[PDB]
Design an enzyme around this catalytic site. Structure first.
Site, short mmCIF file in Angstrom:
data_model
loop_
_atom_site.label_atom_id
_atom_site.label_comp_id
_atom_site.label_asym_id
_atom_site.label_seq_id
_atom_site.Cartn_x
_atom_site.Cartn_y
_atom_site.Cartn_z
CD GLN A 19 -1.20 0.07 3.71
OE1 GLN A 19 -1.72 -1.01 4.00
NE2 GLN A 19 -1.44 1.19 4.38
CB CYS A 25 -4.73 -1.18 5.30
SG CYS A 25 -5.39 -0.52 6.87
CG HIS A 157 -3.20 -2.49 9.77
ND1 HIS A 157 -3.30 -1.86 8.55
CD2 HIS A 157 -2.33 -3.52 9.59
CE1 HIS A 157 -2.53 -2.47 7.67
NE2 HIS A 157 -1.93 -3.48 8.28
CG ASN A 173 0.34 -6.07 6.93
OD1 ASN A 173 -0.58 -5.33 6.59
ND2 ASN A 173 1.20 -5.76 7.90
#
Length: 208
Positions: A19, A25, A157, A173
């Site tokens: 990202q 995210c 997150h 992630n």
């Protein structure tokens, strides 16, 4: 339910993305689950556009953050999402472009909160999005092994659970290949609301 499952090994997950210096995210995690459910249902693995959401999902705030529900809703209302190739990521919000509707979903479902048994059941069916508290230094500098904290339960997150073993969740992630284990982190299953609050707010897309 399987004792373990890894959707990466079933061909339902695209290569790890990054990202960059943009707080998108909420877009990367949401889109990842759509890429996966599409492959599970049609057999076709396609990389989709996060940039489209960053530019056009007005209910959310581009690089300043967003919510899962609004992201999935945008995809549904818009009639679909375009590919990464046709609408590349820039790591900065820009004018919303017209886009092709390559992949589409029918809806989304929330998983019961702070119930890892229910979360395990959902993940066994398809990758699911979850929110975690990633503010701790240990999480940010994670390199390898089974992460067991410390971390709080303040959601800030968004990531994706793409699998599990008896002792941990396999989490994808969106910080690129050079963070954690090739972009992934194994988080200990501790019950309750989960490590770093991973079991607090899970969702997954649906597609008939």
């Amino acid at each position: 339910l399987p004792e373990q499952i890894d959707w990466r090994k079933k061909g339902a997950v695209t290569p790890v993305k990054n990202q960059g210096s943009c707080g998108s995210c909420w877009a990367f995690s949401t889109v990842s689950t759509v890429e996966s459910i599409n492959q599970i249902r049609t057999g076709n693995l396609i990389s989709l556009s996060e940039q489209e959401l960053v530019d056009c999902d007005k209910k959310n705030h581009g690089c300043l953050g967003g919510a899962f529900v609004f992201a999935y809703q945008y995809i549904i209302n818009n009639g679909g999402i375009d590919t990464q190739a046709n609408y590349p990521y820039k790591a900065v919000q820009g004018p919303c472009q017209a886009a092709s509707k390559v992949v589409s979903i029918d809806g989304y479902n929330g998983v019961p909160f702070c119930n890892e048994x229910a979360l395990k059941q959902a993940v066994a069916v398809q990758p699911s999005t979850v929110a975690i508290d990633a503010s701790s230094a240990q999480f940010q500098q994670y390199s390898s092994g089974i992460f067991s904290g410390p971390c709080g339960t303040k959601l800030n997150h968004g990531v994706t659970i793409v699998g599990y073993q008896a002792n941990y969740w396999i989490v994808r992630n969106s910080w690129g290949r050079y963070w954690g284990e090739k972009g992934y982190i194994r988080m200990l299953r501790v019950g309750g609301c989960g490590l770093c609050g991973i079991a607090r707010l899970p969702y997954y897309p649906t597609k008939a």
